[PDB]
Every structure is written in C-alpha cells, then in structure tokens.
C-alpha cells in the first residue's frame, strides 16, 4: 500500500533532517552563492589554510597534509555518530539482533559517508566544518603522496552521483537501503534485514517516481551507483593501510579503523 | 521532558551492551550459579593457577606475582579500548575539542575500570578471562610484598559499591556521567562538557528513581561513591611508581603509560 510507503518516506526524511545538521538543500545554497547571507571562507592554498584555522575554529612540526587528514578523521568520527542515530530511527532496525546492528553500521558507514560527502561537493571542492569552509579540489590535490590522492576519487564519484540530482527526501531512503544490506560479513539473522531493505526499496522506488517523474529508470541508476560506492570504499581502506606506514596512544584508540 | 531522558537512557544502555562484552548481569549469573552461564575454574594457589592456563584461555620463570600483574595489565588495556568505544557513543562527546576528549578519557578511564570491575567481584574474589576464571581475594592478597596489596582496595570498594545493587542500565548512565566530568585538570572548554553531564545527571536521576523506586536517595548515594573512586586511583598510581623502581625490567603498556602522568 503506497500510503505506508509514503508514510515511511516522510518518517525517514524527518529523522534524517533531525540527524544530519548540514542537509543537501542547505549545502546546495551555500555552494551556488544563492544564499548570500553568509559566505564560507574558501581555502585554496597554504596561506588560505593557515588563515582558515583563525576564522573556522578546529582543535589543532605537524605537517600540513597530516593535520588536514587528522581533521578528516575527526569529522569521520562525528558522522559515524550521526549515522548511528539515523539508523536507530529506521523501522525495524532496533528490533534486530544487537550484533547485527553493530555489523550493519560497521560496514555501512564508509558507504554512507561518501554518499553524503557528495552533498557537500561540486567539481571544484568540498564544504567543511558545517559549511563555514570550502576546501578547493585543487588544493586537496596539491598535497604530497599519498595525501593528494585521498579525496580525488571521492570528488570523481560525487560529480557523477550529483548528476542524478537527488534531494534530501530521496537520499534519506537511499541511506536507509545502504544500512540494511543483508550481505555484510558476519550477520546472524539476515532475514529481517532483507525484509526491511525490501520495504525500504519499495519506498525508494515510489519516491523517485513521484519526485522525479521525468527521470527514467532513476531507481536502477541509483542502485547501480552502489557499485561505485563499494569500489570507492575498497580503494579507500587500502589507502588507509598505506598511510598506516607513513605516520599518541589515546588518539590512536579514538581513531580505530572505521 | 522525561521521554527525552528515557530515550537517552535506552541509547546509552544499548551502546553499553555493544561495547562491554562481560556485563554485570552475565557476571552475576556466573557468580551465583545460574544455568544461563557456566562454571568458572577457580584459582586460589599456584597449583590451581598452573592448572588455569590448561583449563582457561590465558595468554602467558617470570615469577607468579609479575605474571598475574602483566595479565591484569593487558586486561586493563582491553578495558580502556572498550571504554573509549563506549565514550564515542555518548552524545556530544565526539563533537568536543579533541584535546578535551583525550583529557576526559585519560582521567575518566581508571575510575570506570574499578566501577565496572566491581561487577566482576564479590566478597571472595573476581572473575577473570571473560568470566572463564575466578581468582580468589585470598590468593591475590597473599602475593609478594608489593603486589599483594594491589587488589584489596578494589575489593573493599566493590563490596560497598555492589551493595547499591545497580544493574547494567544504571551503570551505563553512571559511567557516562563519570566521563563527562569537567573538573579534570587541563580541560580547554569546561562548559560544553558540563552541559552534557547535566543532561546525563538528569538521565541518571530519572533512571534511578524509575528502576529503584524504593531505594531512597540512591542518586545522591551513587554520586558520593565517586569519592571512593578518586581515592582508589591515587593509591594505584603510587603503588605503580613503586614497581617501576623495584623491577626496572618490568614493562608497562604504552596506552597505559600515557594515561599515567605525574602530577
Ligand atoms: C577522512 C580521513 C579518514 C577517513 N577514514 O579513515 O574513514 C575518512 C575521512 C573523511 O572523508 N571524513 C568525512 C566524513 C564526513 N564528511 C566529510 C569528511
Ligand atoms: C592491574 C595492574 C595495572 C593496571 N593499570 O596500570 O591500569 C590495571 C590493573 C587492573 O586491575 N586491570 C583490569 C581492568 C578491568 N578489568 C579487570 C582488570
Ligand atoms: C579540515 C576539515 C576536514 C573535513 C573533512 C572534509 C573533506 C576534506 C578533507 O580531506 O579534509
Ligand atoms: C590473567 C588476566 C588477569 C585478569 C585481570 C582482572 C583483574 C584482577 C586480576 O588480574 O586478578
């Protein structure tokens, strides 16, 4: 019944607005200069970076590309918590085996992070720190190996992902689909997981149809992007290993892999 | 609104289950004799100790007292890792300044060790190796000179703390109150810490009165235990500085060494 699919779609959208501060509707305004009420500090090279810690406050000898990467880790840890709280609002998620919940979040966050990073990106850079900042794609490239290689694949993916012109109400259901993948390693009771993903998949299909009637087979194209996602993540984890032989103790524990 | 504080209580209980594999409910099922859990092998002398590595999974002629000490030292490392994971689930914690996160963990972690260790203790001893073993208080107090006195203050606190009859969902909120202190030496921005803790304190208070309605002033009686916790740490680090000079061949784990900072 489409009423329950539209009900589910509104629920997830509300829960996604509450859980993720900087939404795509918001970030799209800041990036296009439409909402001139406040313009982010742009970081385009070293001196703009050094200046950037003065305007935008952060927490942090200690080379530039390392400090940027560390701040990227800091932000990752925050996004995990926002994702965890979003997941808890997906109908049926909390009722799952606690270990399956943990396994679903553990393998699902890198996918969701790069998905949602695309909301903050265009071909020329990425909003940082709630969008008070904008780090140019070209400045991120100008970092030494392996660090200049780090964000370029994500920019690459976002440019194509954003060409789908999804909005927050679309993404809210997409993100739920990603979390409820029954093929994560080590799951103990795949059935209720896949039962929820089928229900979320129906909701996503009805949503893309009404929200994008002119976008033929958008549902399928969005599902195909989850290929680019998994390949992104696979390439991302190995880079992190290369880094773990380029670069404390309590910090090491806060930034355990994931 | 109570509903908001109940939701926070459920959130923290949920994350506590996910971060701490040996809960108090499990540990009491093992200690009291329930059939949901199985029987510990009991170490009370060197013979039973020697049988323990056979029967119980350990990881370890580097004399008995030192061997126990390195084993209990490696378990502390694992507990620190577990506490660090639970902390990141405390809402607002990861949004704090990174320096204050490290500082909250550095001081909060040992007070949490001995709070939760109380869950593994009764009058007579303490579970070990994820509840597969049980090391008697007497065998611990009988260890040589310096080492014989490491655990007895923990047993003394645990016996009084356990008298409160807190359960895991109480402990989850209480451990979060501990982490978000704000009176820790060196904190850069005390106010966002104190705002979180006040929410935790509100959460703990509603939880204690719903979960233990007959237990008058349990909230206040639980906050006063934070003093016994402070005292247990200080005795510990001073006893640690003795071993550092006695056995200058004994090594401390780096995670644990950085947590310990003179003055
Ligand atoms: C930066 C550095 C390391 C990792 N990681 O090892 O998972 C991830 C990131 C990253 O891109 N974090 C991020 C999350 C959300 N928004 C922006 C950046
Ligand atoms: C024993 C010896 C040294 C230290 N330390 O420097 O923190 C800790 C311990 C100890 O009691 N570890 C422990 C933690 C949690 N559960 C059981 C034992
Ligand atoms: C210094 C802020 C870092 C936030 C992470 C957003 C992506 C850009 C980066 O790699 O730093
Ligand atoms: C060999 C592991 C030791 C378990 C650590 C628990 C603390 C109490 C003790 O060690 O006796």
Give a quick set of tags describing it.
Drug design; TZDs; Retinoid X Receptor; Therapeutic targets; homodimer; transcription; binds 2-chloro-5-nitro-N-(pyridin-4-yl)benzamide; Nuclear receptors; 4 strands
Commentary on this structure:
The first copy, chain A, has 258 residues and is mostly helical. Chain A is 64% helix and 5% strand. In chain A, strands 1-4-3-2 form a 4-stranded mixed beta sheet. The first copy, chain A, is globular, with a radius of gyration of 19 Å. The interface between A and B is medium-sized, with 22 and 25 residues. The complex binds 2-chloro-5-nitro-N-(pyridin-4-yl)benzamide (EEY) (2 copies) and nonanoic acid (2 copies). The site of one nonanoic acid (KNA) has 11 residues of chain B, from helix 4 and strand 3.
Strands of the largest sheet of chain A, in order across it?
Answer: 1-4-3-2
Q: Which two chains touch over the largest interface? A: A-B, 22 and 25 residues
User: What's the number of structural domains of chain A?
Assistant: 1
CATH architecture descriptor name of chain A = Orthogonal Bundle
SSE sequence of chain A, one letter per element: HHEHHHEEEHHHHHH
Could you tell me the CATH topology label of chain A.
Retinoid X Receptor
Roughly what percent helix of chain A? 55-70%
Strand content of chain A: 5-15%
Q: Oligomeric status of the shown chains?
A: homodimer
Distance between the termini of chain A: 38 Å
What is the top-level CATH class of chain A? Mainly Alpha
Strand count, sense and closure of the main sheet of chain A?
Answer: 4 strands, mixed
Structural class of chain A: mainly alpha
Outline type of chain A? globular
